[PDB]
């Protein structure tokens, strides 16, 4: 409530600006639109009005085709995004006032857009201003992004974000998928080998089975290969130990009646893939046709490509979490893939699936879930709810002076702690 009485000092100014904004009849008019006013004159003036008060108060602004724009504050690498709207739905008939003539009651402001979204826009705005008035030492930039087109849902695909920087965190009450960083996208898929049904001479080494990995999203910490050894057991055991030593790994081998069991420990999470290293050792040997192609595939595409590089998809992130092989079915890799907003996974998997068929392998992809914002997990959104709790216990549309100044003091708290650290 140091916040709350900090807002007390700006009361006149807040109501005055809100009045200015409310007096503009920023209702959509598609019939009157033009290049200068792509959703009508009304909304265009409301957007400009925000720019004017920003210029009046020393802030930089940036306009986008006269349909949306932003007010800029603060400094630092991260930008906090606060999205809102100054366009307004029409006045239903029979009000007990003129909807675009703000009436200032003893304790309330009555007009259209008092609730959505002009009250809150001004509230958000004055937060940034008041902090600017105190010469705070900003740690994050802020983009107060203002729209006029109710047909936008702020999608990464909608106009503003077609070209403008994504907020690294933020608040967007109305939007389902606003273009704001949050959760990385996710897919899983399998690389399945075509078993080559072809006779051959008896190899030095035959892979009977390979197993590594329980979950798509964990680094396998264990790998086991079982191998029928034709002649020389002693060299492969010696080389395996040297391999363990050179790559700083734990593992061992067991021999019984010509069956060699090779086992590698590795470290997990979601820290060394045991299966990939074990396949890397197997590539030095003369194996049967199918184990050889299977082992070679992992070396060409998978080994030491934590970040997609070898699949030419790289931060994008790939985990090889399942690895099987037997004589019968011929093995497969189960892949987990994470990616940030702005990676093209379609054309990527296209170039990959196509390029792989060369080696009798094919993609079978699982479900794909694209990158997206999660309000409830947004660091700002949480600080806002923390401050409500910390502070608080369309026809004839009105907003209370107390909701109005409550909102402001709440943005103030949350914004402060996230931008001037707290």
UniProtKB/Swiss-Prot annotation:
Gene3D superfamilies: 3.30.70.360, Zn peptidases. Transmembrane segments: none annotated. Keywords: Dipeptidase, Hydrolase, Metal-binding, Metalloprotease, Protease, Zinc. Its EC number is 3.4.13.-. CDD domains: M20_PepV (cd03888). Zn(2+) 1 binds at residues 116, 151. GO terms for biological process: L-arginine biosynthetic process; proteolysis. Its cofactor is Zn(2+). The active site is at 87, 150 (proton acceptor). Binds 2 Zn(2+) ions per subunit. GO terms for molecular function: acetylornithine deacetylase activity; dipeptidase activity; metallopeptidase activity; zinc ion binding. Zn(2+) 2 binds at residues 85, 116, 174. Belongs to the peptidase M20A family. This is Putative dipeptidase SACOL1801. It comes from Staphylococcus aureus (strain COL).
